[PDB]
Amino acid sequence: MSSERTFIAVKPDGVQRGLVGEIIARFERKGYKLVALKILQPTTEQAQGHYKDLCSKPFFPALVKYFSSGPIVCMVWEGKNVVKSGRVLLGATNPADSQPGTIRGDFAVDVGRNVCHGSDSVESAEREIAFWFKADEIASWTSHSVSQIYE
Amino acid sequence: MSSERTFIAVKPDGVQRGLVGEIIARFERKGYKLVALKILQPTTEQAQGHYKDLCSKPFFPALVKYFSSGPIVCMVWEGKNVVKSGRVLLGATNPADSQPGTIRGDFAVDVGRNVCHGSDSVESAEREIAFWFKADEIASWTSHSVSQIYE
Amino acid sequence: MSSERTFIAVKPDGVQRGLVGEIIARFERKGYKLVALKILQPTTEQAQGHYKDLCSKPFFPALVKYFSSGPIVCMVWEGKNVVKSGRVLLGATNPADSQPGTIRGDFAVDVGRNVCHGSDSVESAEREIAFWFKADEIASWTSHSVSQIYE
Amino acid sequence: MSSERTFIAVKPDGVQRGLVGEIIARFERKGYKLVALKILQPTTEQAQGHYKDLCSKPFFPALVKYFSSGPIVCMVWEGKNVVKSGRVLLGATNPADSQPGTIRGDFAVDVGRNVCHGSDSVESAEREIAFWFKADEIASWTSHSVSQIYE
Amino acid sequence: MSSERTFIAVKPDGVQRGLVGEIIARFERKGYKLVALKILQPTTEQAQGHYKDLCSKPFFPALVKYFSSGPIVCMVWEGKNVVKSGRVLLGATNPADSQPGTIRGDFAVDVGRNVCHGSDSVESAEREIAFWFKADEIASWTSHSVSQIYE
Amino acid sequence: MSSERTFIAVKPDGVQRGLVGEIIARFERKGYKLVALKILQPTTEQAQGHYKDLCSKPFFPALVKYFSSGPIVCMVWEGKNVVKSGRVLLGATNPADSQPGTIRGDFAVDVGRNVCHGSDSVESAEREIAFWFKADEIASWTSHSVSQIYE
Numbered sequence A, B, C, D, E, F: 001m002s003s004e005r006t007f008i009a010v011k012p013d014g015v016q017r018g019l020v021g022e023i024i025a026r027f028e029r030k031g032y033k034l035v036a037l038k039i040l041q042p043t044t045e046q047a048q049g050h051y052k053d054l055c056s057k058p059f060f061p062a063l064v065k066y067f068s069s070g071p072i073v074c075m076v077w078e079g080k081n082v083v084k085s086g087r088v089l090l091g092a093t094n095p096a097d098s099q100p101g102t103i104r105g106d107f108a109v110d111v112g113r114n115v116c117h118g119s120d121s122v123e124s125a126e127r128e129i130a131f132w133f134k135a136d137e138i139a140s141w142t143s144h145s146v147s148q149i150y151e
């Protein structure tokens, strides 16, 4: 099911600690396709609508203030199982339950500063993709390698 | 039990995607000993006898055609627990159930293209070793490091 | 002087070979600040204008058509001497004159498939950046580690 | 709980196989703080008091002789959850039950030669810290990054 | 020109230090194509013939006996300028004149323990390859990414 | 000649950026032997004496105060030509004249924030080592792989 996409974001602490290329390179070596990319500082409202599903949690306002306080890098990747493989690569929410070899397990310590975001489902990936990206910032191309990665 | 050996093969998709040195280096850093090495294109019959145990599976013919369609790299490694440590290093059959830090978890997406093979048991390792290698292509040497890795 | 900017493009061949994060990581290690990023397929038009100042040369239309055959990743890095140093990280024009340790040194064979592009001077950086980026695609932020990197 | 510390030791086989920087770098990338460091050859008595809790095990004397036979490198690291994250990073006692991405899973084969030690609890970390280090060999400093790693 | 071939040998000291996959990876990154590989212990005879064109020199018998004290890994890589570029990846003869980024730059101290060997010219490559490999040990394949690497 | 020693210091800026293990790893790869290590904050006194032989220069007090603003990691490596080669791994004084592949090449921008320090000669090594280390802080050991590295 090769056309699946997920949205991955490096977060302000990930951008500040020099981790964007490291994380891009993990998904590249895996065989996934980068189809979208930008760096920007979310606004409060962007930070709020992105984490909309957790407005009741008492961490919410500290989260929205932190996410909107510097540049994040947004990406979209495409391939088979990219959403769930995305989350296996990122690691558990708390970097303390996160295994070595995962992004959060290798580079982060605190659940509040956990470097990177990844869609947790296909329907959520499709909603995060449409939030941050206009269709048309989404490059369509074909990897010279798809026959080495799929069939 | 230091004399155990396993057979590891990079497969056509692993060779094409430039992953042979990466995988050799993982077993090296671990402390294992490379005792055999070659690059060749299996034949249909080689591809069939190597995967002999699965002639009833409906993936078999696509597998045998894929395995025989380009060069693989065969290796044999020697050390304590090398067969089972080999399989922990390779990762689950499906690269989607495979953890980050494992060969299939780090570089592959599709079960059909999963970069590398490893004997799954000692008796199977001994049968794959004898299939691909003549005795005599098997170098005997002693690591200057065995006293740092064992005792 | 510390607000100097440079334009780095990963070429279509860099993107197709899975080099994007590797080049980003190297700029980040060296202490530079990423302020703008994107992926898109240059039209022939943008290839001609990006390379206007070389239209009279024989390779120019080969060059033109290649650069617009696939997505590229455009970047703008900030920091002190980032223009000379970007040139330095990328290595000579022609990978045959490129030292290992540089991106062309390590990754490239043909001058025609040399993976990446970097502004040759400050003037050229200013042109290529306004060329490829609108004012609102640029982030402005300050890196927490400015004091560890700049006297 | 940022002031937690743990004691990590590379062991004689880790020092001999050129693994100290690799292991220091793992804890660095994770966000932890190095607060203490030295290289020395334990004595028999140091080797015995360090592993005091296992004087009844029949491996004890081979262990104490091995630990005291060359230089180890001792370190103390500081951060939230550093003791338990330390042990997740090191891997299972036996390098054969240890996952890829962990120090013992990536570099070791034999339980008897397993490259590195890590405190297994806070009270044990505090006792190993006081055994090997005088207060005053413990540098107090503040990472320019604590606001990127915590809050 | 694109069918140029080179002979790379990892020396016994490269094999004993766990460098085999590191050197393979570097050739592969740079875009070269591996076509032949093996491990074996050179007899003194093969050491003399491999180095015939230097029998009159004082180091020659030191050289001869070392090169035949342990397994080596022989390779043949294909691509454009692969002979000059292999020399380039390996770095100067004497690691004291070798830049970091090169294999001797990064890994070697003594000219007598310089890890790896590479053909000095096309003539020499042709000789050393037919020297060390039979026609049937050579793979012939075409790399899926030929177009990303070669104009 | 094989007992030559050099003093490497990671500067406060190297420690604050998470470079300590990266620099240790590079010395270790190249085959050098670590014999002494520690972390501490130089007093202004020790900064003045470490750099006595440059008190007349204009940068000297900037230099003095920086070097004593934070912990540094001091090291002493042993091996053949380790003084010239340490200089070589670190790269030119001023990172603007430093090749990629070197520690300043890859990691540094300002001559004032150049990450690391290395003895410029054998005399200077002898001075800086007795300067920074007591006789009992030095380990003496022999590396199992001495024969793989030294003719």
Ligand SMILES: Nc1ncnc2c1ncn2[C@@H]1O[C@H](COP(=O)(O)OP(=O)(O)O)[C@@H](O)[C@H]1O
Pocket (backbone or CB within 6 Å): A059, A063, A092, A093, A111, A112, A113, A114, A117, A118, A120
């Ligand atoms: N207990 C908590 N304390 C502070 N911040 C939290 C907590 N749980 C979650 N967050 C912040 O909220 C983000 C979103 O949480 P959630 O969607 O449940 O996890 P995930 O990012 O792994 O899908 C986290 O990644 C973290 O930055």
Ligand SMILES: Nc1ncnc2c1ncn2[C@@H]1O[C@H](COP(=O)(O)OP(=O)(O)O)[C@@H](O)[C@H]1O
Pocket (backbone or CB within 6 Å): B059, B063, B092, B093, B111, B112, B113, B114, B117, B118, B120
């Ligand atoms: N469901 C499947 N679809 C396509 N190919 C498969 C499937 N299962 C296995 N194969 C191919 O068969 C190879 C051998 O399968 P098997 O021996 O069960 O796994 P393993 O290689 O992990 O021991 C796989 O590695 C894969 O290349």
Ligand SMILES: Nc1ncnc2c1ncn2[C@@H]1O[C@H](COP(=O)(O)OP(=O)(O)O)[C@@H](O)[C@H]1O
Pocket (backbone or CB within 6 Å): C059, C063, C092, C093, C094, C111, C112, C113, C114, C117, C118, C119, C120
């Ligand atoms: N002599 C040549 N033959 C073929 N292609 C060339 C030649 N010179 C340049 N090219 C191609 O066009 C680009 C020209 O830009 P140039 O000013 O020559 O240097 P740079 O890329 O180092 O800034 C290269 O990066 C390369 O892909």
Ligand SMILES: Nc1ncnc2c1ncn2[C@@H]1O[C@H](COP(=O)(O)OP(=O)(O)O)[C@@H](O)[C@H]1O
Pocket (backbone or CB within 6 Å): D059, D063, D092, D093, D111, D112, D113, D114, D117, D118, D120
């Ligand atoms: N079965 C065993 N055989 C030989 N040595 C062992 C064995 N179990 C433990 N040791 C040695 O003892 C050290 C301490 O054991 P223990 O404290 O239980 O494990 P850990 O180091 O993971 O906390 C081990 O790391 C290993 O070097």
Ligand SMILES: Nc1ncnc2c1ncn2[C@@H]1O[C@H](COP(=O)(O)OP(=O)(O)O)[C@@H](O)[C@H]1O
Pocket (backbone or CB within 6 Å): E059, E063, E092, E093, E094, E111, E112, E113, E114, E117, E118, E119, E120
């Ligand atoms: N002056 C010397 N002293 C000691 N050993 C040497 C000397 N020159 C060469 N050697 C050894 O013999 C080999 C000789 O081959 P050579 O033509 O000198 O260069 P290369 O290996 O760079 O092709 C080296 O790779 C090295 O191990």
Ligand SMILES: Nc1ncnc2c1ncn2[C@@H]1O[C@H](COP(=O)(O)OP(=O)(O)O)[C@@H](O)[C@H]1O
Pocket (backbone or CB within 6 Å): F059, F063, F092, F093, F094, F111, F112, F113, F114, F117, F118, F119, F120
């Ligand atoms: N011209 C200069 N301007 C500013 N700072 C300098 C200058 N020269 C040296 N420094 C600082 O002081 C140190 C001086 O030592 P030096 O003999 O110049 O070389 P090295 O560090 O390469 O041994 C440097 O490492 C650097 O941080």
